[PDB]
From a paper:
Collagen model peptides (CMPs) serve as tools for understanding stability and function of the collagen triple helix and have a potential for biomedical applications. At the molecular level, collagen forms a right‐handed triple helix consisting of three peptide strands, which adopt a left‐handed polyproline II (PPII) type helix conformation and are held together by interstrand hydrogen bonds. A repetitive unit of three amino acids [Xxx‐Yyy‐Gly]n with a conserved glycine (Gly, G) and all‐trans amide bonds is observed. To further study the effects determining collagen triple helix stability we investigated a series of CMPs containing synthetic diproline‐mimicking modules (ProMs), which were preorganized in a PPII‐helix‐type conformation by a functionalizable intrastrand C2 bridge.
Using common SPPS protocols, the Fmoc‐protected ProM1 and ProM2 derivatives were successfully incorporated into the [XY] position of the CMP sequence Ac‐(PPG)5‐PRG‐PPG‐[XY]G‐(PPG)3‐NH2. [a] Peptide sequence: Ac‐(PPG)5‐PRG‐PPG‐[ProM2]G‐(PPG)3‐NH2; torsion angles were averaged for the central nine amino acid triplets. KGaARegarding the overall structure, the three peptide strands adopted the typical triple‐helical conformation, and no distortion could be detected, which was underlined by comparison of key parameters and alignment with (PPG)10.21 Considering the modified positions, ProM2 units were assembled in a PPII‐type helical shape (like all the other Pro rings) and were well‐embedded into the overall structure. In combination with the fact that all ProM2 units adopted an endo,exo ring puckering (as predicted by DFT calculations), a close packing of Pro rings within the triple helix was observed. The crystal structure not only confirmed the synthetic success of introducing covalent linkages in collagen models, but also demonstrated that the triple helical structure was maintained upon this manipulation. Because of their desired endo/exo flip the proline rings of Ac‐ProM2‐OMe were positioned in space that is also occupied by proline rings in a collagen environment. In fact, this endo/exo flip could be found in a crystal structure of the ProM2‐CMP facilitating a close packing of proline residues (see below). In the case of Ac‐ProM2‐OMe, no conformer with an endo ring flip at Yyy was found in the initial conformational search (30 kJ mol−1 cutoff), demonstrating the general exo propensity of ProM2 derivatives. A pseudo‐equatorial orientation of the rigid ethylene linker relative to the Yyy ring is sterically favored and thus controls the Cγ ring flip depending on the configuration at Cδ (endo for Ac‐ProM1‐OMe, exo for Ac‐ProM2‐OMe). Regarding the reference peptide, the stability was slightly decreased for the ProM2‐CMP or maintained in the case of the H2‐ProM2‐CMP.
Residue numbers in the entry:
A (entry chain C), C (entry chain B): 1 to 30
B (entry chain A): 2 to 32
């Protein structure tokens, strides 16, 4: 018969970079 | 004597991607 | 007798997309 199965493969590659983040209004003028 | 066994199963997913790179807010109100 | 243990499995899929990034305050008002 065939031999036993081989080993699991390696982890896949990293996922893509996330989306850009979301700043507040600037300071008031004096 | 028999032939090679089947390939192994797929690996797990890769790691989550890195965090993204936000824009400035609007100008402040007038004084 | 059985054959040899089999070849390596394939890589997993890509990981999930990253989270959103972290912006600055806007410019001061006039």
């Amino acid at each position: 018969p065939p031999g036993p199965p081989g080993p699991p493969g390696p982890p896949g590659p990293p996922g893509p970079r996330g989306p850009p983040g979301x700043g507040p209004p600037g300071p008031p003028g004096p």
